[PDB]
Nucleic acid binder design. Structure first.
Ligand SMILES: CN[C@@H]1[C@@H](O)[C@@H](O[C@@H]2[C@@H](O)[C@H](O[C@H]3O[C@H]([C@@H](C)O)[C@@H](O)[C@H](O)[C@H]3N)[C@@H](N)C[C@H]2N)OC[C@]1(C)O
Ligand SMILES: CN[C@@H]1[C@@H](O)[C@@H](O[C@@H]2[C@@H](O)[C@H](O[C@H]3O[C@H]([C@@H](C)O)[C@@H](O)[C@H](O)[C@H]3N)[C@@H](N)C[C@H]2N)OC[C@]1(C)O
Ligand SMILES: [NH3+]CCC[NH2+]CCCC[NH2+]CCC[NH3+]
Lengths: 148, 46, 195, 203, 97, 52
RNA sequence: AAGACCCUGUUGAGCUUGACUCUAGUUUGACAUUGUGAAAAGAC
RNA sequence: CCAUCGACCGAUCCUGAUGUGUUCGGAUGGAUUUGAGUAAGAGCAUAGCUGUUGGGACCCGAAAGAUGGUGAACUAUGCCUG
RNA sequence: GUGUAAAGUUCCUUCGACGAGUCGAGUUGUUUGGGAAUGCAGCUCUAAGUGGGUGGUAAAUUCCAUCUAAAGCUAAAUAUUG
RNA sequence: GACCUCAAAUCAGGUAGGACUACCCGCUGAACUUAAGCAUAUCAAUAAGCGGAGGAAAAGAAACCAACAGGGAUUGCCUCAGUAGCGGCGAGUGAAGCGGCAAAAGCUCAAAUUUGAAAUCUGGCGUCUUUGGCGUCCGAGUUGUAAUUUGAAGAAGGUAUCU
């Protein structure tokens, strides 16, 4: 609200906080990103390195849907098991009856290998998997099943 | 004055460039002796 | 005009943008009016449902394959499986799409099942129908009554079967095979015919 | 019928028979007024394809239009601006000669509606077109369920609004990625993309 | 059909294939006994275009490459040039008989 | 200008918090009196009346 | 009478030219408009 | 939370096992290199002061430039009639 | 109710016409986010019949996918300083 | 005496123009301004100028999007996204497919021998129960007016005898 602004406090003081010498003017230094290579180089080269120039190749008509592949790590994998049956599955899963985790159905494209799994066999269904993620799943007696 | 004519202006009255103008000059340039094969007093016969 | 450490902004306000400002002050009014329009439209044709029955289709785009949604209309082959002519289906509240095709079997079966459920719940009136029967039906909401259902993710328990080749290696080999498929067949062609 | 033969013959514009016919008809059309009434279509199959019927209330006009581009009509070539706008020659009109023919005929016969038009002939100076016209007031048209639609006032001078085939062509009214800018009207799409939409609970 | 995995050649999920009756709109390119008959009469009445006659004589002089380069110039694309030169050879293959 | 901000978003959970806090305050007689209500002849709050 | 002289401003304008960048006009060629013959030099 | 030596992931350089569409694969071990990374998450949302950029942009102020119109009752010049 | 009239469905056989100075190509100008050229327009060239268009890097060769131009009508959701 | 083409009439009956401005369909088209100068660029495919509508207009039932396990006329909102891209690659600029919703609606010709029958239509006259019906006479029309078909098909011959 306007009653909290310093405009109210500057009433009665000549320059409104803008100085007597500098004399707040319209656009000293230009408009927008003017002079980024000339008189604003000392700002851009310090706080925005990399600003000027071209790097890499162009990609005409990029469709972002081609690259949809959300990641899930191993340490978060068991959140996808039904919460009502998570405690039962941990104690009862074995090589004959292991939980099936459909990562794609939950919105994920690749399983990554960060963290530690429960020492419980799991059947993990995924479009993609990292090398370490599959080794850790196979080490707790589980398996990775590729889907499409 | 120079607005009025290609010959206008100067601190003396003078043309300042050749008054013989090419046949291929455009309107506003053709003042003087247009496409003159020669100039000056004719002496002898023709 | 460039100053202390701050993100570089892209504010596109260099045209006469104030001549083209649209403030939706009428959001609540349009909500109420759109609601009255639905009310009158339903009252006009009762007890026939307002909404035509719509099919269930997969969504395109590897980002949206997992999803299923309502499509535009049932295909000619799907209606043919139930025995309904395309021109007749439009008069009994069934949407028709001549553009969609049925390459696979799963969506075809799902929509044939939808058509059979709808046709089993359908009651057509005629001249022999008395107003007592007509007054006995309420205006059903077809979209809610026949909803689109996501097929469930696989859950539960199953035996663990471990192949000798890892899934990561399978992905790597599939990529390599695709990448060099064109040049390995060219090396093959130029070799068999010469030898 | 003969219409298929006429269709296939009219595609052979460089054969001796068609060259002879086009030469003589170009001379004949060039000897008459720039706009004149045609007693009948000179290409009856082409007229049929575009919606014409040999009924009372269907009218054919012929018109020639001058060929070439559009010289910018500024005095002595001065544009009074930046060099990017200094061009006078090699400029082009954004509507086609077909649309110009349709519009001039529509102005001459202001009691009629322009249905469609087609090319008939061509020389270095003129292109010749034939314009199909329909009389909204004629009872043969007002009683015809296949042509009643044009009586409605929303089709008043549809050729002046680019609503005919040639007009819709020049407006860029077509489907797909090649027509993103003009698909639903160029100016409409520009206005939509340059409107700041503010809701009550700004998000 | 599809391989069942997310990468490689013929990638994608497996579905049970269903036969599709081809749409009638997919026959657009096919010729009919109507058009073939009409077009052959019209070629008798009309004759040849001047560039086609220039192109017959190139083939007769055994200038195969010379005819293709003119046909591409006149028609616009290399694909249409290939069809036209082939057609104009068959015209010669019908004068000998 | 008309495109001033007129309406304000509030998180729905926080709005519900405020509703619950307001209902709880209605059972405290000191707050009801300081609010300015003439409730001095009511024995207890909440005041509940039969469904008739 | 917010110097008309002088200076400053990355403020102009009138005028000039072998300034930078263009332009109406004009000229030159090709193609189209554009058809029907003959003789003589050329090339497959 | 700080200083310091490591370890993990991506880029770069090197090494190069079992194997092969024999040119692919890339086990394994190294490198004063490199990243807006990891190493038991901290974010999202609303509001307020201050600061930033685009907007008439704290208020008033050019000389100019453009588009479309109105004037030869003054005056300049030709013409017609006195 | 002129219901030997009209229309609808399934199956078999033979067929199955489908828009040209247009498509397309070159060039010029303009325009577009459209980048060896997005649309539009002028001029030159000028088609075909499983052909034609499109598939966001120019070209030839081989496939594949997807529609069916150059003719036409049509409520609603959308706009609204009159 | 026909026909074709072209005229005339204060011929019988109609129709157009002009106005309004917020929104709508097109044509034409700047510069101030920003780039701390400036010419490409920007302002802007904007203002001014011109033509044409309606209660909405335009668009619209794929010569579409896609590359998926595929969607399925048009339009709008949210998002995509200040992104792919364009740009003295500077200042700046900048869409689309998908996804969620609002609303949902589909179709018509040309190209076909009715050929055992122009089956079609304007007008005049008479008449009536008059947004028109009936009868009749000219005219239009075979250089093609009706019925039949529009690619999702469909047609011509058979069909189960069914609705
Ligand atoms: C390959 N040689 C490595 C040498 O590169 C170095 O390893 C660095 C390591 O020090 C860097 O790590 C450095 O920077 C990271 C920061 C970037 O996250 C800090 O977290 C870390 O404390 C710091 N030491 C790490 N980012 C890359 C390794 N290659 O460590 C010594 C070494 C073994 O000789
Ligand atoms: C308790 N274990 C800790 C573990 O939590 C973690 O601690 C990090 C520590 O390494 C980080 O610190 C690290 O990275 C910072 C950074 C500014 O570059 C540097 O000081 C330096 O590279 C390094 N010490 C510190 N910034 C946060 C702690 N939680 O790092 C490993 C550890 C030291 O064993
Ligand atoms: N609204 C601006 C009208 C002028 N057009 C200029 C922009 C055109 C874009 N050119 C970019 C370079 C060509 N791809």
């Amino acid at each position: 609200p306007t009653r909290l602004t310093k405009t109210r406090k500057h009433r009665g003081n000549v320059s409104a906080g803008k100085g007597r010498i500098g004399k707040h003017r319209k656009h000293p230094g230009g408009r927008g990103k003017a002079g980024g290579q000339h008189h604003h180089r000392t700002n851009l080269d310090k706080y925005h390195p990399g600003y000027f120039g071209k790097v890499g190749m162009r990609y005409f008509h990029k469709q972002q849907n081609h690259f949809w592949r959300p990641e899930i790590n191993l340490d978060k994998l068991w959140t996808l098991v039904d919460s009502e049956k998570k405690d039962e599955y941990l104690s009862k899963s074995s090589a004959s009856a292991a939980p099936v985790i459909d990562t794609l159905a939950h919105g994920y494209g690749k399983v990554l290998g960060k963290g530690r799994l429960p020492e419980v066999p799991v059947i993990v269904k995924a479009r993609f998997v990292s090398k370490l993620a599959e080794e850790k799943i196979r080490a707790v007696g589980g398996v990775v099943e590729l889907v499409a | 004055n120079p607005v009025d004519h290609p010959h206008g202006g100067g601190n003396h009255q003078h043309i300042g460039k050749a008054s013989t103008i090419s046949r291929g000059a455009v309107s506003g340039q053709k003042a003087g002796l247009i496409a003159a094969r020669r100039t000056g007093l004719l002496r002898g016969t023709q | 005009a460039i100053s202390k450490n701050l993100p570089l902004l892209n504010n596109h306000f260099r045209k006469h943008w104030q001549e083209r400002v649209r403030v939706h002050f009428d959001q609540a009014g349009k909500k109420a009016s759109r609601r009255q329009s639905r009310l009158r439209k339903a009252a006009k044709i009762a007890p026939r449902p307002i909404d035509a029955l719509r099919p269930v289709v997969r969504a395109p785009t590897v980002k949206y394959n997992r999803k299923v949604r309502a499509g535009r209309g049932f295909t000619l082959a799907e209606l043919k499986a139930v025995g309904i002519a395309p021109k007749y289906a439009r008069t009994i509240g069934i949407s028709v799409d001549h553009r969609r095709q049925n390459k696979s079997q799963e969506t075809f079966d799902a929509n044939v099942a939808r058509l059979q459920e709808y046709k089993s719940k359908l009651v057509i009136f005629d001249k022999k129908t008395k107003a007592s029967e007509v007054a006995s039906f309420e205006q059903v909401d077809v979209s809610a009554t026949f909803p689109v259902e996501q097929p469930a993710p696989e859950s539960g328990l199953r035996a663990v079967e471990v192949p000798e080749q890892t899934a990561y290696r399978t992905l790597r080999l599939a990529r390599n095979e695709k990448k060099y498929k064109g040049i390995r067949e060219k090396r093959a062609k130029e070799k068999a015919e010469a030898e | 019928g003969a219409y298929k033969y006429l269709e296939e013959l009219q595609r052979k514009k460089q054969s001796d028979v068609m060259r002879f016919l086009y030469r003589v008809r170009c001379w004949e059309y060039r000897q008459k007024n720039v706009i004149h009434r045609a007693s009948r279509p000179s290409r009856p199959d082409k007229a049929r394809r575009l919606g014409y019927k040999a009924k009372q209330g269907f009218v054919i006009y012929r018109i020639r239009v001058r060929r070439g581009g559009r010289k910018r009509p500024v005095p002595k070539g001065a544009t009074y601006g930046k060099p990017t706008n200094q061009g006078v020659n090699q400029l082009k009109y954004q509507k086609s000669l077909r649309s110009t023919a349709e519009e001039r005929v529509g102005r001459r016969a202001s009691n009629l509606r322009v249905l469609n038009s087609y090319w008939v002939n061509q020389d270095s100076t003129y292109k010749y077109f034939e314009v199909i016209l329909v009389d909204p007031s004629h009872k043969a048209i007002r009683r015809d369920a296949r042509y009643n639609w044009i009586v409605n006032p929303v089709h008043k001078h549809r050729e002046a609004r680019g609503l005919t085939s040639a007009g819709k062509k020049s407006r860029g009214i077509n489907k797909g990625h090649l027509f993103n800018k003009t698909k639903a009207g160029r100016r409409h799409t520009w206005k939509k993309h340059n409107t700041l939409s503010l809701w009550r609970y700004r998000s | 059909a599809k391989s069942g995995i997310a990468a490689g050649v013929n990638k994608g999920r497996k579905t049970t294939a269903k036969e599709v009756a081809p749409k009638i709109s997919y026959r657009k390119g096919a010729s009919s006994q109507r058009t073939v008959f009409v077009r052959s009469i019209v070629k008798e009445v009309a004759g040849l275009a001047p560039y086609e006659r220039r192109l017959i004589e190139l083939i007769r002089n055994a200038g195969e490459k010379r005819a293709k380069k003119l046909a591409k110039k006149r028609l616009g694309t290399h694909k249409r040039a290939l069809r036209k030169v082939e057609e104009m050879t068959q015209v010669i293959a019908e004068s000998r008989r | 200008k008309t495109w001033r901000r007129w309406n304000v978003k509030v998180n729905h959970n926080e709005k519900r918090y405020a509703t619950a806090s307001a209902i709880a305050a209605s059972a405290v007689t000191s707050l009801v009196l300081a609010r300015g209500h003439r409730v001095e002849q009511v024995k207890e709050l909440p005041l509940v009346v039969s469904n008739e």
